[PDB]
Amino acid sequence: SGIVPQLQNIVSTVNLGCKLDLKTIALRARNAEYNPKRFAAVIMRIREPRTTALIFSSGKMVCTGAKSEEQSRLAARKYARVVQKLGFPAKFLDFKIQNMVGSCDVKFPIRLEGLVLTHQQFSSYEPELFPGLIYRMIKPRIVLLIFVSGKVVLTGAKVRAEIYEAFENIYPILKGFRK
Amino acid sequence: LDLAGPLLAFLFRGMFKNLLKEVRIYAQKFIDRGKDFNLELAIKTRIIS
Amino acid sequence: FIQMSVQRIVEDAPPIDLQAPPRYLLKFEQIYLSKPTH
Amino acid sequence: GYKFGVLAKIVNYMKTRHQRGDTHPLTLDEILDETQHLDIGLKQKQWLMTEALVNNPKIEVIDGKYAFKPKYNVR
Amino acid sequence: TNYKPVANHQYNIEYERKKKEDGKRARADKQHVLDMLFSAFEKHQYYNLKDLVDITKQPVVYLKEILKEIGVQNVKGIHKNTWELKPE
Amino acid sequence: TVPKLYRSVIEDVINDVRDIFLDDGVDEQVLMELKTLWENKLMGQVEEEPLNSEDDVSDEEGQELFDTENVVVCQYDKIHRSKNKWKFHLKDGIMNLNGRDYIFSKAIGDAEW
Amino acid sequence: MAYQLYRNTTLGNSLQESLDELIQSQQITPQLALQVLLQFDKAINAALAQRVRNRVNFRGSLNTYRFCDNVWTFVLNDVEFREVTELIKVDKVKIVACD
Amino acid sequence: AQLKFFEQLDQIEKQRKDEQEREILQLRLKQKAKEMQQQELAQMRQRDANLTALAA
Judging contacts by C-beta atoms under 8 Å, the chain B residues touching residue E3 are 40
Q: Which domain holds residue A105?
A: 1-11+98-179
Cβ atoms within 10 Å of E41's Cβ, excluding its own: 22
Cβ atoms within 10 Å of E18's Cβ, excluding its own: 11
Residues pairing with F106 in the sheet = G55
Q: Is E9 part of any known ligand binding site?
A: no
Rounded to the nearest angstrom, the minimum Cα separation between A37 and chain E is: 5
Residues A126 and A137 in one domain: yes
Residues A50 and A60 in one domain: yes
**What fold, for G54-99?**
TATA box binding Protein, subunit D; domain 2 (2.30.18)
Using alpha carbons, list the distances in angstroms from residue A121 to A117, A136, D74, H10: 9, 9, 67, 91
Element (H, E) at A34: strand A33-34
Give Cβ neighbours of residue C13 (< 8 Å, ≥ 6 apart): B16, B17, B20, C28
State the DSSP string of A79-103: HHHHHHHTT-----EEEEEEEEEEE
- Total of domains in chain E: 1
In chain E, the residue whose alpha carbon lies closest to the alpha carbon of B41 is E3
Give Cβ neighbours of residue B37 (< 8 Å, ≥ 6 apart): B26, B27, B30, B31, C24, E11
- By CB neighbour count within 10 A (0-12 exposed, 13-18 middle, 19+ buried), where does F111 fall? buried
Is the CB of residue A99 less than 8 Å from the CB of residue A158? yes
* Range list of H helices, chain A: 22-28, 69-85, 112-118, 160-175
Q: Do chains B and C touch (3 or more CB pairs under 8 A)?
A: yes
- Counting as contact any 3 or more CB pairs under 8 A, the partners of H are A, E, F, G
Q: Is the alpha carbon torsion for E25, E27, E28, E33 positive or negative?
A: positive
Residues A16 and A82 in one domain: yes
Touching check for E73 and chain D: CB below 8 Å? no
Is the CB of residue F93 less than 8 Å from the CB of residue F102? no
Using alpha carbons, list the distances in angstroms from residue A20 to A24, A80, A86, A91: 8, 12, 10, 12
Residues A6 and A44 in one domain: no
User: Which candidate in H50, H51, H52 is best for mutational testing of the A interface (most A CBs within 10 A)?
Assistant: H51
In chain D, the residue whose alpha carbon lies closest to the alpha carbon of E86 is D8
- By CB neighbour count within 10 A (0-12 exposed, 13-18 middle, 19+ buried), where does A111 fall? middle
Which residue of G2, G3, G8 is in closest CB contact with H56? Answer: G8
Residues A129 and A89 in one domain: no
User: Which resolution in angstroms does this entry have?
Assistant: 4.2
Biggest alpha carbon distance in chain C? 44
The rounded Cα C25 to chain-centroid distance in angstroms is 12
User: Which candidate in E30, E31, E32 is best for mutational testing of the H interface (most H CBs within 10 A)?
Assistant: E32
CATH number of this structure's domain F1-43, picked from the four choices 3.40.190.290, 3.60.20.10, 1.10.287.100, 1.10.10.60? 1.10.287.100
Rounded to the nearest angstrom, the minimum Cα separation between B37 and chain E is: 6
Asked if residue E45 is part of any domain, the answer here is: yes
Kindly give the pairing relationship between strand F70-82 and strand E82-84: unpaired
The rounded Cα D16 to chain-centroid distance in angstroms is 11
Instruction: Tell me the residue type at A30.
Output: R
3-state DSSP call for residue F79? Answer: strand
Is the CB of residue G53 less than 8 Å from the CB of residue G66? no
Is the CB of residue D10 less than 8 Å from the CB of residue D35? yes
Q: Is A2 left (phi over 0), alpha (psi -120 to 50) or beta?
A: left
DSSP state of G7: G
CB contact under 8 A, H33 and E35: no
State the DSSP string of B24-40: HHHHHHHHHHT----HH
Per-domain boundaries in chain G: 1-53, 54-99
Kindly give the pairing relationship between strand C16-19 and strand A151-157: unpaired
CB contact under 8 A, H51 and G68: yes
* Final residue of a structural domain among A67, A97, A127: A97
The count of CB pairs under 8 A between chains A and F is 28
Residues pairing with G56 in the sheet = F107
- Total of domains in chain A: 2
Element (H, E) at G30: helix G30-51
- CATH number assigned to the domain comprising residue A126: 3.30.310.10
Kindly give the pairing relationship between strand G55-64 and strand F106-112: parallel
**C-alpha closest to that of A170 among A149, A69, A151:** A151
Instruction: Tell me the residue type at A144.
Output: L
Residues pairing with A104 in the sheet = A152
Q: Is F88 left (phi over 0), alpha (psi -120 to 50) or beta?
A: beta
> What is the distance between the alpha carbons of residues E25 and A37, in angstroms, rounded to a whole number?
6
3-state DSSP call for residue A33? Answer: strand
Is the CB of residue A32 less than 8 Å from the CB of residue A44? yes
- By CB neighbour count within 10 A (0-12 exposed, 13-18 middle, 19+ buried), where does F7 fall? exposed
In chain D, the residue whose alpha carbon lies closest to the alpha carbon of E30 is D12
Rounded to the nearest angstrom, the minimum Cα separation between G88 and chain H is: 24
3-state DSSP call for residue E56? Answer: helix
Question: How determined?
Answer: cryo-EM
Question: What is the phi/psi pair of residue E34, to 5°?
Answer: -65, -45
User: What is the dihedral angle through the alpha carbons of D29, D34, D38, D42, rounded to the nearest 10 degrees?
Assistant: -30
State the DSSP string of D33-74: HHHT-TTS-HHHHHHIIIIIHHH-SSEEEETTEEEE-TTTS-
- CATH number assigned to the domain comprising residue E71: 1.10.10.10
DSSP state of B49: -
Instruction: Tell me the residue type at A154.
Output: L
Q: Which domain holds residue E68?
A: 22-84
Q: Do chains F and E touch (3 or more CB pairs under 8 A)?
A: no
Superfamily of domain G1-53: Transcription factor IIA gamma subunit, alpha-helical domain (1.10.287.190)
What is the edge-to-edge ordering of all strands in the sheet holding A151-157? A33-34, A42-46, A51-55, A60-66, A6-15, A93-105, A151-157, A142-146, A130-137, A123-126
For chain D, the residues whose C-beta falls within 8 A of a C-beta of chain E are 1-6, 8-9, 11-12, 56
Using alpha carbons, list the distances in angstroms from residue D37 to D6, D7, D41, D45, G43: 8, 10, 9, 9, 29
Touching check for H51 and chain A: CB below 8 Å? yes
Rounded to the nearest angstrom, the minimum Cα separation between A24 and chain H is: 9
Is the CB of residue H39 less than 8 Å from the CB of residue D5? no
Rounded to the nearest angstrom, the minimum Cα separation between E52 and chain B is: 18
